[PDB]
Structure 1
Amino acid sequence: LSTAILKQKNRPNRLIVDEAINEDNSVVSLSQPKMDELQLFRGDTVLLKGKKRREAVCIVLSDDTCSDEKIRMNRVVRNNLRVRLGDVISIQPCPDVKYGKRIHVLPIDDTVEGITGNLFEVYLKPYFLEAYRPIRKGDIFLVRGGMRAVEFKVVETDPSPYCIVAPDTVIHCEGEPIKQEDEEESLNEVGYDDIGGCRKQLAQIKEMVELPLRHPALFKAIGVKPPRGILLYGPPGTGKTLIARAVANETGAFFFLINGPEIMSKLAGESESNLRKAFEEAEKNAPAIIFIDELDAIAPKREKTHGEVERRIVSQLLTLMDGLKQRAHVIVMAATNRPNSIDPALRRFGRFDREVDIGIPDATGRLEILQIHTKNMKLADDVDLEQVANETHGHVGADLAALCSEAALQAIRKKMDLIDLEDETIDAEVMNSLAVTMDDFRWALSQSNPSALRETVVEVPQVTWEDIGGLEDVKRELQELVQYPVEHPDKFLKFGMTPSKGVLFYGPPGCGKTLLAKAIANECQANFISIKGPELLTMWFGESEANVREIFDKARQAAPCVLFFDELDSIAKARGGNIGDGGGAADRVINQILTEMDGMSTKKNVFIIGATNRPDIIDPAILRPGRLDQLIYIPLPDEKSRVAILKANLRKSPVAKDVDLEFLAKMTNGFSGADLTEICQRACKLAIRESIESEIVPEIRRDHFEEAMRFARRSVSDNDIRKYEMFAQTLQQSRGF
């Protein structure tokens, strides 16, 4: 019901199509009930448009060539004047459009190449086929007694509609044959189909660019301020320039690209004139889009700058963006790879308030990027893209293109023994029959160094409740504090209470403190930001107080989301504990966390998990009624839950039938979950060794698990069990003394 806007169905007119044996393109397909509900105006001419000012003409009411009471669609139209079946016809009445001076005809191929002679001897014959020299906007017919592979590039035209040319005007004939680069750089313009992964941000870009420009009166009638400043920020190489280039081609607005280094490459004084002219050009036409690439390169912070020209550039840009009123209809957007260096005077209201985060795509997101990038190459049958999307983790849009290039080149290397190095006249059986296989992708995958290993990884984790063995007590409670306030807000609002925002995890180490948070994030279909203990201590030492500011608000922007603080023990380990150095464990970072976690409003859905295994050195400041008041104890797995833990850990291994899990679960009493995983890893490693020994069968037998128990190592002592139990019954008493 909520997602019933993208669908378009329940209309008994459209039907599925498949491959048929009807390839007769003599006449185009029409519809008899089409004009029956429309009131057209006839008598001189009709104004209509198709796609990219390109339309075809045919015969009208000259049927009776084949059998009626049927329909068909040829597959021939997938290479010109068409991108796919299911294109909506867009017609906008707009007379008096841009016009050139005059162009009649120009030659490209038949200019000087080969024999010329008188030139009216070779193409005059294959022309008289019932056509009185039809002149239109792309009416070209295919007639050839040979290969039927003739094509001439005629793209540039001054008119949108048809027109009648008039005599008594002189035309210059000083043209020149052009190369293929200018046409290829224009035909390969990207659009909304060439971008994948960032399916969410494109909705915002469309709703905030296309809507105000296409319907200016609709926004004025309801009285809404159109956003005129959009800043695109995120990791480098995610494709920030690609959306900017895509939104320009699909809109009828005048696009003006402004580069960052290009502006600074000019001399002193001359650079400001470029910005002034760029704004003036966009101002005199109402549909105009201004994109400033790499804003940080031209608009740095005024508190760190050294040159006086940069300050003048920033001041000029500030004045120019303030001079734009609502009658300009100019949407200024910019892209940068670090939002932190942008001058704060630009990111405030009226200049740049609307911000779009281009984050790192998921396995689903990068799968579509791979499918887009590999759409032009030739792959084999064993080519599995979602696998490669799975193993790739920190890969961004440009990383995938580099990986594809490396995989393609590795395929080139395998054929170097047959392809001559000096002879350039290679045979034609090597440009087509060779495709990229799995050895190529797997080889190139091992030595790929992505540029996106350092940011926060924003997912719904893949860890579900199946990976966690036992612990049925905590599964219900963790749901009761996370899912209820987000699924049924009315039930909470009726009682007039405040849901608790924050849960602390403590207990013996290696028992599921991280898997629980990942599982509770997976089921809620929300994001998951994990921050480790030493991860906070290294990200500070450069004396950077603003580093965590873009971390806390990131969770708020990606609502709903959960915040995880794993390995909290190491954070308190830097100063000790109850006495520590001389006082508590609340060092520089703990105070930061406490100060910022108080500013989160209750009406939000942001949620925080803290996980630690050192309750004796934690400070009372963390456990406040409103920060981490929920204290949940994870006990050691007992006889009943170890079977489930082992079943979860053995889901991917071909375990035998004669092995008894509950039998080997009965003297593994005083262990933890991490100990059981290590036991299983040793047991399966013994299987690998045995399997490879006999080669000079690959199943985990009973003896493989029997040998592991003798070498088993206990991770928690008897004193620690009692100590954990005695803290678990009584923790919050630590507050006060």
Structure 2
Amino acid sequence: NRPNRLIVDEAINEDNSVVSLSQPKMDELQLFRGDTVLLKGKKRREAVCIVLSDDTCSDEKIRMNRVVRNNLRVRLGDVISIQPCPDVKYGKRIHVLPIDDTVEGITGNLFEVYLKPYFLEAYRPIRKGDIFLVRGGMRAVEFKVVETDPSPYCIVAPDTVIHCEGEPIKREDEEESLNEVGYDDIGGCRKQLAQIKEMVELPLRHPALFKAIGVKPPRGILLYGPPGTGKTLIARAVANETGAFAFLINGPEIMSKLAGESESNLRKAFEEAEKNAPAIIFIDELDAIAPKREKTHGEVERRIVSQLLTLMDGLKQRAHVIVMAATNRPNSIDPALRRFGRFDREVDIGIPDATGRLEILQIHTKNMKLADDVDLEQVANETHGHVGADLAALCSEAALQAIRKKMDLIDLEDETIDAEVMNSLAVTMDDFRWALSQSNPSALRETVVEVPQVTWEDIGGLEDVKRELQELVQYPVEHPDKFLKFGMTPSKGVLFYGPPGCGKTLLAKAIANECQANFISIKGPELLTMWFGESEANVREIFDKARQAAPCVLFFDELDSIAKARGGNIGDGGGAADRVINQILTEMDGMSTKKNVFIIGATNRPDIIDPAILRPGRLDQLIYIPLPDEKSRVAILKANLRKSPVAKDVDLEFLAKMTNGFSGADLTEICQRACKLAIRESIESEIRRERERQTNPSAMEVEEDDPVPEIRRDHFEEAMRFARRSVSDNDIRKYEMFAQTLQQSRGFGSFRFP
């Protein structure tokens, strides 16, 4: 709300040299003409030059040369703050050096070329780091600042010598700085960027308060996640968005030198980060410098580990230094670094979801000349198991395909037509469809943690189940004051039981959606793989994973599978207990309802389940999920068929009226068979037409009466011919009697108080 906080707008003149004003401001201000001016924007990036040729357009705005969109700033919506400061001294000469272009063709002097006539009445009032493309020719060619006789921004006088020693420099060498990567090159990690910014911006940006407050800052931050998820760029981004100076370290480089070079290098990094402050250090591949003490064979290894422990313990100086570092798992580094005063904060970066993949694709494809029929959102949904680097690869392959696909033969004839032909090249959806099949992703076995889309209307009945689940999961995330004011303790899990294919995973996903909560799934083969392998210590990792990501629904499907692998209930003589469910017990007894983790289990044989887990302070509730009734079948059929081209004559009300005792899985089967038939007929018609035409000596024929555009009723009728049930009525009777037993256990008449 400061007086001179005004918006930035377009430019009217070509070069960066003349600045504008807004005269309604200078009454309270002291804006005069001269040499320099203090102008304030983002990241302390500035371009100080002459000012005051304005009043062409309306007030409460600051007009700024075109190049100042990435000079001094990033985009529009910023604000320019205004304070002159004239009367600067005179040094002999300053800032003369181009970078990319005029290296082409003739060399000359690179100041005597075309930049000759600019200084007239404007004898070089400018600042460092200034970049504006200018020429006496096309008026668009780079120019950079290198030399500093005095470093502050100075003034020029004639009869001087300059320094253009160095042949210009290009794009890659200064690319990270030129990119000035900010929080726009980073996709798929919005939450965790929020967390990091919250951690750091106060200690790094407002440090004098952080002094006057007394609270202690972070010492060590550890970033987790698989390879290819943008962790270095994060560090650069935070450093540049905070003004802070960054020092970057690389593990295998520290370990590629002699035992004395390595430790010197560490010490010097920590030193340089103490001198320049407030700083940031980044360590990549820390599992290289410091793995599990066991694996360490040698004496230089353990010794540089000890050096790093020492150097971490000695950062207590009120010196505004933060050390960030990157690994894959936390069980991959020596555990002595994970200690109060050392790396005590952690962030999991994880695999993206479809919105994140869409962000990454938008970020990459902004210099590609796409084509009109590309729905990158269909792609982002067709990229399961991909991390960001995998999508960079996929874009690359699509584009290079589009190139070699047609213009190979012209590409061969060496000439300059290549240039215009590239200026006429595009990328199609068939390119992405070919690349996407030619890909081998990297995180198909990683654990997926996300919010699901499944909603209550993909289900149609089971209304009291819905209400129950809501009382159990929704009310304590939203209304905990009630649970205090009545002093009640909230349940932490439940067990679903009933027959197969009646929709137990859908309900868990739906109640996770309503609370916008993460969902994790553990399946039967995972439990049997821990049994067969005597590896039941992986349960603890599952529960820790859910801890980080709370609030979460942690779902255990096929919980009765180890009991079936060893007979059923007769089986051995061993009773019900086993090593994997015993660890699940141990872990549920060791977590609090303060952290909001809800556990659902699911079974189809409730009679062979260890009864210890159905005890108080454990699952302790039982809900029956039956075979669907009419409305449920109608809604299930619609949910199945809401992506195929269907007719209108067909009525699913009657299909539901004649499908009683059918599991949803069956109805799904019906739909798949009907579409199977439609496909077969369409393909046959296409074959046999185009042939019958090839035979015909009709030199001309364009009449495509597209045979099959839909799915008609006789498809469905032929399908129902193969209709099948998978759930008998002796089974229904078994579940009904496992419900009524436990409903008679609740045998009490009416109880009226006196």
In which range does the TM-score fall when normalised by the shorter chain? 0.7 to 0.9
Change (3 A) 1:124 1:528: closer
Change (3 A) 1:363 1:497: same
Are the aligned partners of 1:50 and 1:91 in contact in 2 as well (CA < 8 Å)? no
* 508-517 vs 35-44, which moves further: 35-44
Correspondence 1:158 to 2:180: no
Aligned mates of 1:291, 1:714 — CA distance in 2: 61
Correspondence 1:50 to 2:41: yes
Report deviation, 1:298: 1.0
Counterpart of 1:342 in structure 2 is 333
Counterpart of 1:66 in structure 2 is 57
Aligned mates of 2:669, 2:295 — CA distance in 1: 52
Change (3 A) 1:567 1:393: same
Q: Deviations over 1:674-693 (max 9, x none)?
A: 11111121122222223333
Report deviation, 1:244: 2.0
Change (3 A) 1:567 1:215: same
Structure number with greater CO (CA < 8 Å, separation at least 6) is: 1
Report deviation, 1:577: 4.1
Aligned mates of 1:684, 1:111 — CA distance in 2: 64
Are the aligned partners of 2:98 and 2:143 in contact in 1 as well (CA < 8 Å)? no
Correspondence 1:556 to 2:547: yes
Aligned mates of 1:61, 1:16 — CA distance in 2: 17
* 460-469 vs 565-574, which moves further: 565-574
Report deviation, 1:132: 4.0
Are the aligned partners of 1:533 and 1:568 in contact in 2 as well (CA < 8 Å)? yes
Aligned mates of 1:251, 1:720 — CA distance in 2: 65
Report deviation, 1:223: 2.0
Report deviation, 1:634: 0.5
Change (3 A) 1:99 1:643: farther
Report deviation, 1:157: 5.1
* 706-715 vs 111-120, which moves further: 111-120
Q: Deviations over 1:175-225 (max 9, x none)?
A: 555565433454234222211221111122222222102222222322211
Report deviation, 1:735: 15
- SS of the residue corresponding to residue 531 of structure 2 reads coil
Correspondence 1:117 to 2:128: no
- SS of the residue corresponding to residue 353 of structure 1 reads strand
- SS of the residue corresponding to residue 311 of structure 1 reads helix
Report deviation, 1:449: 1.4
Aligned mates of 1:120, 1:693 — CA distance in 2: 73
* 709-718 vs 13-22, which moves further: 13-22
Change (3 A) 1:97 1:239: farther
* 595-604 vs 543-552, which moves further: 543-552
* 720-729 vs 269-278, which moves further: 269-278
Report deviation, 1:303: 2.8
Aligned mates of 2:88, 2:327 — CA distance in 1: 36
Are the aligned partners of 2:524 and 2:561 in contact in 1 as well (CA < 8 Å)? yes
Report deviation, 1:663: 2.5
* 726-735 vs 473-482, which moves further: 726-735
Aligned mates of 1:629, 1:644 — CA distance in 2: 31
Change (3 A) 1:455 1:548: farther
Aligned mates of 1:432, 1:602 — CA distance in 2: 61
Change (3 A) 1:113 1:643: closer
Counterpart of 2:417 in structure 1 is 426
Report deviation, 1:371: 0.9
Change (3 A) 1:78 1:140: closer
Are the aligned partners of 2:495 and 2:623 in contact in 1 as well (CA < 8 Å)? yes
Correspondence 1:408 to 2:399: yes
Report deviation, 1:623: 0.8
TM-score norm. by structure 1 comes to 0.87
Correspondence 1:78 to 2:89: no
Are the aligned partners of 1:534 and 1:571 in contact in 2 as well (CA < 8 Å)? no
Report deviation, 1:261: 0.5
Report deviation, 1:588: 1.6
Report deviation, 1:131: 3.2
Q: Deviations over 1:416-472 (max 9, x none)?
A: 443333736553222111111101111101121111111210111121112113222
Report deviation, 1:713: 1.1
**TM alignment of 1:573-722, pairs within 5 A:** 573-696=564-687, 697-722=708-733
Aligned mates of 2:477, 2:60 — CA distance in 1: 55
- SS of the residue corresponding to residue 303 of structure 1 reads coil
Aligned mates of 1:232, 1:93 — CA distance in 2: 44
* 517-526 vs 541-550, which moves further: 541-550
Report deviation, 1:715: 0.1
Change (3 A) 1:132 1:557: closer
Change (3 A) 1:704 1:47: closer
Are the aligned partners of 2:504 and 2:602 in contact in 1 as well (CA < 8 Å)? yes
Change (3 A) 1:349 1:39: farther
Report deviation, 1:595: 0.8
Report deviation, 1:524: 1.1
Are the aligned partners of 1:458 and 1:527 in contact in 2 as well (CA < 8 Å)? yes
Counterpart of 2:2 in structure 1 is 11
- SS of the residue corresponding to residue 67 of structure 2 reads coil
Aligned mates of 1:298, 1:97 — CA distance in 2: 50
Report deviation, 1:415: 2.3
Aligned mates of 1:141, 1:486 — CA distance in 2: 55
Counterpart of 1:734 in structure 2 is 745
Are the aligned partners of 1:659 and 1:702 in contact in 2 as well (CA < 8 Å)? yes
Change (3 A) 1:215 1:40: farther
Change (3 A) 1:239 1:134: closer
Change (3 A) 1:526 1:267: same
* 474-483 vs 114-123, which moves further: 114-123
Aligned mates of 1:502, 1:718 — CA distance in 2: 30
Change (3 A) 1:388 1:270: same
Aligned residues: 728
* 556-565 vs 726-735, which moves further: 726-735
Change (3 A) 1:693 1:503: same
* 180-189 vs 165-174, which moves further: 165-174
- SS of the residue corresponding to residue 372 of structure 1 reads helix
- SS of the residue corresponding to residue 591 of structure 2 reads coil
Report deviation, 1:97: 16
Change (3 A) 1:19 1:444: farther
Change (3 A) 1:505 1:39: farther
* 349-358 vs 470-479, which moves further: 470-479
Aligned mates of 1:496, 1:256 — CA distance in 2: 52
Aligned mates of 1:165, 1:128 — CA distance in 2: 10
Aligned mates of 2:368, 2:45 — CA distance in 1: 28
* 398-407 vs 34-43, which moves further: 34-43
Question: Sequence identity of aligned pairs in percent?
Answer: 100
Report deviation, 1:354: 0.5
Change (3 A) 1:431 1:343: same
- SS of the residue corresponding to residue 56 of structure 1 reads coil
Are the aligned partners of 2:500 and 2:604 in contact in 1 as well (CA < 8 Å)? yes
Are the aligned partners of 1:300 and 1:343 in contact in 2 as well (CA < 8 Å)? yes
Aligned mates of 2:87, 2:530 — CA distance in 1: 60
- SS of the residue corresponding to residue 123 of structure 1 reads coil
* 512-521 vs 699-708, which moves further: 699-708
* 456-465 vs 661-670, which moves further: 661-670
* 476-485 vs 71-80, which moves further: 71-80
Q: Deviations over 1:283-322 (max 9, x none)?
A: 3343221211111111111133222221112111111111
Structure 1, unaligned stretches of length 5 or more?
A: 1-9
* 313-322 vs 470-479, which moves further: 470-479
* 324-333 vs 93-102, which moves further: 93-102
Are the aligned partners of 1:623 and 1:732 in contact in 2 as well (CA < 8 Å)? no
Are the aligned partners of 2:8 and 2:61 in contact in 1 as well (CA < 8 Å)? no
Are the aligned partners of 1:501 and 1:627 in contact in 2 as well (CA < 8 Å)? yes
Report deviation, 1:106: 5.2
Aligned mates of 1:98, 1:582 — CA distance in 2: 97
Change (3 A) 1:28 1:284: closer
Counterpart of 1:3 in structure 2 is none
CA RMSD between the two structures = 4.4
Report deviation, 1:255: 2.0
Aligned mates of 2:89, 2:555 — CA distance in 1: 58
Aligned mates of 1:95, 1:601 — CA distance in 2: 64
Report deviation, 1:488: 1.1
* 448-457 vs 125-134, which moves further: 125-134
Report deviation, 1:607: 0.6
- SS of the residue corresponding to residue 622 of structure 1 reads helix
Are the aligned partners of 2:501 and 2:663 in contact in 1 as well (CA < 8 Å)? yes
Higher helix proportion: 2
Correspondence 1:545 to 2:556: no
Report deviation, 1:649: 2.3
Aligned mates of 1:94, 1:596 — CA distance in 2: 66
* 98-107 vs 564-573, which moves further: 98-107
